[PDB]
Design an enzyme around this catalytic site. Sequence first.
Site, PDB file in Angstrom:
ATOM      1  N   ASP A  70       0.591  -3.337  -8.976  1.00 24.93           N
ATOM      2  CA  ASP A  70       1.036  -3.138  -7.467  1.00 24.93           C
ATOM      3  C   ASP A  70       1.223  -1.584  -7.272  1.00 24.93           C
ATOM      4  O   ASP A  70       2.533  -1.258  -7.308  1.00 24.93           O
ATOM      5  CB  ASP A  70       2.072  -4.004  -7.279  1.00 24.93           C
ATOM      6  CG  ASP A  70       2.400  -4.240  -5.882  1.00 24.93           C
ATOM      7  OD1 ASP A  70       1.674  -3.377  -5.131  1.00 24.93           O
ATOM      8  OD2 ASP A  70       3.047  -5.151  -5.381  1.00 24.93           O
ATOM      9  N   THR A  71       0.565  -1.007  -6.415  1.00 28.41           N
ATOM     10  CA  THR A  71       0.935   0.463  -5.916  1.00 28.41           C
ATOM     11  C   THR A  71       1.878   0.359  -4.729  1.00 28.41           C
ATOM     12  O   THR A  71       2.420   1.523  -4.769  1.00 28.41           O
ATOM     13  CB  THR A  71      -0.647   1.076  -5.432  1.00 28.41           C
ATOM     14  OG1 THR A  71      -1.021   0.317  -4.368  1.00 28.41           O
ATOM     15  CG2 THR A  71      -1.466   1.338  -6.542  1.00 28.41           C
ATOM     16  N   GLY A  72       2.298  -0.811  -4.127  1.00 29.89           N
ATOM     17  CA  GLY A  72       3.036  -0.782  -3.264  1.00 29.89           C
ATOM     18  C   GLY A  72       4.562  -1.151  -3.659  1.00 29.89           C
ATOM     19  O   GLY A  72       5.560  -1.012  -2.954  1.00 29.89           O
TER      20      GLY A  72
HETATM   21  C1  LIG Z   1       6.018  -4.780   0.752  1.00 26.67           C
HETATM   22  C2  LIG Z   1       5.751  -3.803  -0.291  1.00 26.67           C
HETATM   23  C3  LIG Z   1       6.520  -2.220   0.327  1.00 26.67           C
HETATM   24  C4  LIG Z   1       6.773  -3.980  -1.722  1.00 26.67           C
HETATM   25  N1  LIG Z   1       6.385  -5.226  -2.228  1.00 26.67           N
HETATM   26  C5  LIG Z   1       5.341  -4.949  -3.004  1.00 26.67           C
HETATM   27  C6  LIG Z   1       4.017  -5.735  -2.522  1.00 26.67           C
HETATM   28  O1  LIG Z   1       2.837  -5.547  -3.281  1.00 26.67           O
HETATM   29  C7  LIG Z   1       4.154  -7.229  -2.481  1.00 26.67           C
HETATM   30  C8  LIG Z   1       3.889  -7.782  -4.079  1.00 26.67           C
HETATM   31  C9  LIG Z   1       4.135  -9.362  -3.923  1.00 26.67           C
HETATM   32  C10 LIG Z   1       3.010 -10.229  -4.093  1.00 26.67           C
HETATM   33  C11 LIG Z   1       3.290 -11.508  -3.877  1.00 26.67           C
HETATM   34  C12 LIG Z   1       4.463 -12.031  -3.777  1.00 26.67           C
HETATM   35  C13 LIG Z   1       5.571 -11.289  -3.783  1.00 26.67           C
HETATM   36  C14 LIG Z   1       5.567 -10.123  -3.839  1.00 26.67           C
HETATM   37  N2  LIG Z   1       3.051  -7.993  -1.797  1.00 26.67           N
HETATM   38  C15 LIG Z   1       3.122  -8.424  -0.556  1.00 26.67           C
HETATM   39  O2  LIG Z   1       4.346  -8.474   0.184  1.00 26.67           O
HETATM   40  O3  LIG Z   1       1.994  -8.935   0.068  1.00 26.67           O
HETATM   41  C16 LIG Z   1       2.083  -9.556   1.169  1.00 26.67           C
HETATM   42  C17 LIG Z   1       2.218  -8.334   2.246  1.00 26.67           C
HETATM   43  C18 LIG Z   1       0.740  -8.421   2.918  1.00 26.67           C
HETATM   44  O4  LIG Z   1      -0.056  -9.078   2.093  1.00 26.67           O
HETATM   45  C19 LIG Z   1       0.635 -10.365   1.451  1.00 26.67           C
HETATM   46  S1  LIG Z   1       7.679  -5.882  -2.638  1.00 26.67           S
HETATM   47  O5  LIG Z   1       7.254  -7.242  -3.798  1.00 26.67           O
HETATM   48  O6  LIG Z   1       8.568  -6.593  -1.741  1.00 26.67           O
HETATM   49  C20 LIG Z   1       8.581  -5.071  -4.153  1.00 26.67           C
HETATM   50  C21 LIG Z   1       9.577  -4.366  -3.784  1.00 26.67           C
HETATM   51  C22 LIG Z   1      10.408  -3.516  -4.475  1.00 26.67           C
HETATM   52  C23 LIG Z   1       9.919  -3.227  -5.860  1.00 26.67           C
HETATM   53  N3  LIG Z   1      10.515  -2.620  -6.846  1.00 26.67           N
HETATM   54  C24 LIG Z   1       8.856  -4.145  -6.195  1.00 26.67           C
HETATM   55  C25 LIG Z   1       8.142  -5.179  -5.279  1.00 26.67           C
END
Ligand SMILES: CC(C)CN(C[C@@H](O)[C@H](Cc1ccccc1)NC(=O)O[C@H]1CCOC1)S(=O)(=O)c1ccc(N)cc1
Lengths: 99, 99
Positions: free
Chosen positions: B25-27
């Site tokens: 996860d690059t985000g």
């Molecule tokens: C929102 C971004 C900026 C940051 N997140 C990463 C994202 O990749 C996040 C990963 C994820 C996938 C499935 C369930 C839960 C989380 N995917 C996400 O929200 O998918 C949504 C947005 C549209 O598609 C669906 S995080 O999980 O909040 C996070 C924050 C801080 C750290 N240290 C680690 C993780």
Amino acid sequence: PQITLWKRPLVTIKIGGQLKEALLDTGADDTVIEEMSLPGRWKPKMIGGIGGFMKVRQYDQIIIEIAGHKAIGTVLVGPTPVNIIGRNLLTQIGATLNF
Amino acid sequence: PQITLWKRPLVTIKIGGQLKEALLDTGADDTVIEEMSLPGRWKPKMIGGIGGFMKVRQYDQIIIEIAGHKAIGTVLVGPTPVNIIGRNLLTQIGATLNF
Ligand SMILES: CC(C)CN(C[C@@H](O)[C@H](Cc1ccccc1)NC(=O)O[C@H]1CCOC1)S(=O)(=O)c1ccc(N)cc1
Ligand SMILES: [Cl-]
Ligand SMILES: [Cl-]
Ligand SMILES: [Cl-]
Ligand code: NA
């Protein structure tokens, strides 16, 4: 390009004629943009992330440029903390992860 | 490898002697793993994203094997629905996003 990950992978996008910054997010299934005006009808969608679920507006077939690459597809609009380019549009610009 | 983004980019990891599936996860700034015990000291942290914030425990200097590649760094532990390998460890395995 080849983007390393020592800093957030932020790029310029263009949508509705406006330039915005967005995060390239391989952990996001979908693309989510902060509040803005887009044309056409929208449909409801609930997405899930680290804090739980939330409701967004789903707009289809929206023209968007991402780091200079043209895409046309689904954009979700809602109270996201940062603009997110997810896999639905990363695939259209030919992005891959490599190691 | 080269990993396309038609599907979630899941790989096998080993952490704390345990095999798990995780999302590249690059985000994500930092790595977040579902609840498990890890050795050493920890401190609390709040991480934010879609839906709001999650409280986690931050453990430093933890080794994870990611698709066969060893890396060390900070691991957050909390009630995440998906194990996430974030940038802090993706850099260490030389991961880049290419298009
Ligand atoms: C929102 C971004 C900026 C940051 N997140 C990463 C994202 O990749 C996040 C990963 C994820 C996938 C499935 C369930 C839960 C989380 N995917 C996400 O929200 O998918 C949504 C947005 C549209 O598609 C669906 S995080 O999980 O909040 C996070 C924050 C801080 C750290 N240290 C680690 C993780
Ligand atoms: Cl799409
Ligand atoms: Cl780290
Ligand atoms: Cl590097
Ligand atoms: Na430690």
